[model samples]
Target: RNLMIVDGTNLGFRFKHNNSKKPFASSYVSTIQSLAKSYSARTTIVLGDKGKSVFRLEHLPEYKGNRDEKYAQRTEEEKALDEQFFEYLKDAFELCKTTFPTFTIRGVEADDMAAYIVKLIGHLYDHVWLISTDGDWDTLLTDKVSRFSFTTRREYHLRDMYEHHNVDDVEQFISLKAIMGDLGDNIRGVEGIGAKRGYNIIREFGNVLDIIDQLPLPGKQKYIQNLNASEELLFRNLILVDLPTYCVDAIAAVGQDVLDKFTKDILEIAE
Candidate 1:
């Protein structure tokens, strides 16, 4: 009755942090199975990111480039361990495939795959459970869809979005993210705008598109100047961050035939 979508890559980060080079595939598979039973899900789909999203990189050439610099500073031993963890993660995914549907596509992030899957098969299930610690996954949430974050050991729903994200719903959440930017991804925002001010700006000026036309908004503040100059950045960020909008493009980039085949396979409900 329920569909469980596991963010395999994000979940593996927990295991990766333990710095254990020993095999953990059995534990990985068991963990997913335990989560499915906990949710009473009839089916599960595990998604992993083989590489960064090419779609986003095309929009902003340096998207997530900051992380690369951070990685460059990592010690050689830490870097080798990182490589080993990823290798083990892929092996665990293969083991998981023995029991559930799994996808790890190159040049595509799991975020988009999760979005595309929800868009495609969400109505087929009575409830949909997204398993990830990523706040970005909240963009896909609905009354019928919720997320469980292992990091917080709590579930998120649209009903209580304000408590967690300081927004009433997904619409406002996306707007807030677009205005303030996602520092983890190296997306820039109006220099002086933080979450509170970003929310206030959206409340008064509407969303990014609405704010674009109303720019230079009759203010002398430094953030206002930054906002006025942010027209193009916001436009680019929207495509980069809006899941439903760009998920299709990212999937299509994988190829129309690939999308068609995936759609066909999923429609059969075998996975």
Candidate 2:
């Protein structure tokens, strides 16, 4: 069977500006569940956790400031929508057992959950469709796993993302984030680097580690010298932007004695 992994929170936040353009029918929970159920694909909505202090917050205080700042000044109505949607999102899946296998974990973002599932089922499925608008998941694409974006309304196969973005290697895409940095997460990747330059640099060196090791003695070298001078800030940024696949809890997402919170609906989202 195929898998349709949706970044529920990502979409919730991404389309905030255009809610009227895409009005919510029931709660945000019902609308998304319906969409996933209609596909009859193995549906999983990975939502960002709340009411928890995870390692990311400790590692980087501004790790998710894009979301925070964007909604920080919204009117009460807008804030209410987010709060209500989050409330219903938890138990709504229980009501829609016939729709899809849905689960959201606290202390982790949907991007990480989607990546972990892909890693788990990459060999089991014929194809994997990661449904989200966020470019962050591009780091997880492989020959078998592709991203199905609602914005583009199609699947970006490995070849498509590569050709369209000029990113020859899929995983190296995150390394671009390391250089260009994502303002959404308040990540400032290397000074004096933008998206195109970061992409080009990653293309040349493969990833951040490679870039660090092979930097010319003047440019990146000098930057690293300053970075080493401030170990706290440097390590925090590293933790903030490094891809989430590496952060999966082995006991939870893998290995025996795993919790059933992630297992009950392993079969399918719809009948």
Candidate 3:
């Protein structure tokens, strides 16, 4: 059976902002069901955000600080509408429970949870599709796992990243992001490197380690200097951006032997 991982919060927020009609929940749920049908997905999992990710915040305190006053900007009526959307989103999840098993762990963001799920159990299915427009999910795309953008209705695979973003694979994608800071998350990367520069560096040198090991390039001494200045930050950003396979560690709690067996099982198909 094909596995479909839905970004519930992403879709919910998208619909919530775009919704103006009286009964909005139906439209939201209908879209999800339509996606499942189009993909021939027999099993579905809906992952939603439960506030901030502890894994990220513990590593960097200013994570997502830009949106701290997001709600404050909204008017009272707008806030009420937001609440209504929240209520409708909750109802939508409850309605989907019969079809899709929903997961929303406190202190865990949906992206991280979805990534972990993909790494742990994605190989068991015939195919895995992650529904989101977030580019961060590009790091998780592979031959078996693809990403579907809700906004553009585009299906993306490993080749898609290389074709569009010039990223060779998942590792390069993470490295590129580590070089270029994510303004949305308030995570600073190397001081001088932007998207183009970061992409070139990753494309040429593979990752940061290789770049640092190589002799300095022409007129790019500033890049090396900036990277050296933020040496600690660069590594931290790498960890902050790189998603681990065992984020939950539920198997570890079960037993060491069981965890090892599970790891081996996952590797067989994943490899």
Candidate 4:
């Protein structure tokens, strides 16, 4: 059977965001469950720990978004709903495992876990399906691995993403993107640089570290200063945005020995 790893937090959050039911529960189960069963694909989900402590922000002050504010803004009623959703989804995965065989892990983003599992198990499976609407998984697409999005209604392969973005290397693609940063998410990359220009700099030279080391920069002077003044900060973001295989700590937590069935038993389910 093939392997299907899910961006559990991504799926959970996106489902909650777009779902309109009374408790704001997920509505994508029919879609994903059916898809998995059709292919007999065993699945795993990775949910990030919701608490502030588990997040990397304490270690790096300018981490990403305002997670605390985001959490605070949730109305009491909505917070309750989120709790229910998390528990319910955990339980649901456990029950689904009775037939489908599923797994999940906390303390890491679902994308990281999915990437780790795919790299560890890619050779064993005929195909690996990374299920998410998140673009980060684009890094994992190879001949044997593919990314499917419920939202995009599209499939991305290594060739397609590389051609579309006009970048040759996947790690370099993400590293360059992080240099520009994602403003919508409030991650501060380079101040003036945008995606296209970031791509150009990466193309002209190579990865961000290479660009910082070799390229003559006029337009991206601020990011250059950023890279020079706060390389520690810049490199950490690079780690966050880079594909999971590059993260040494993550590699230690989830390695080749532990990417299989029975992990789904940890999910929460309601009576």
Error of 4 at 47 (Å): 6.6
Listed per candidate, the RMSD to the true structure in angstroms reads 1.5, 4.7, 4.5, 5.4
Regions more than 4 Å wrong, model 2: 13-53, 70-72, 81-98, 163-166, 216-238, 250-271
Model 3 ranges with Cα > 4 A deviation: 20-23, 212-221, 245-271
Model 4 misplaced regions, further than 4 Å: 22-30, 37-65, 162-168, 184-186, 215-233, 251-271
Q: How would you encode candidate 4's per-residue C-alpha lDDT over 63-160 as one tens digit per residue?
A: 54565577689999978876777776665455545544344444344555566566555566678777777776777778888777766667777878
TM per candidate? 0.95, 0.73, 0.84, 0.75
lDDT of every predicted structure (CA atoms): 0.85, 0.58, 0.74, 0.59
The stretch of ten residues in a row with the least summed lDDT in candidate 3 is: 245-254
So what's the TM-score on candidate 2? 0.73
lDDT of candidate 3? 0.74
User: What's the C-alpha lDDT at position 266 in model 4?
Assistant: 26
Clashing pairs in 3: none
**Candidate 2's residue-wise lDDT over 1-271, tens digit each?**
6666767655555455355344442455565656556555554544444433255666666667677777889899978877765555444444434454455565655665676666655566666777777766777777877776667666677777656565666556656655556776776656655667657656655666665665452345554444334334434455555555455542243332433545444433222
Decreasing lDDT order of the candidates: 1, 3, 4, 2
Q: Extract clashing residue pairs from model 2.
A: 99-269, 100-269
Question: Per-residue CA lDDT of candidate 1, range 106-162, in tens?
Answer: 778898888988899888889999999998999998999999998788999999878
Clashing pairs in 4: 90-267, 90-268, 91-267, 91-268, 91-269, 103-264
Residues 1-271, model 3: lDDT tens digits = 6778889988887786576435466666778889899888876778788677777777788888877767789899978887787788887777766666676666677776677678778877888989988878888888898899867878899988877566778888778877787888888887778877778877776786676565354455787667656656767787778865435543343345644664564445343
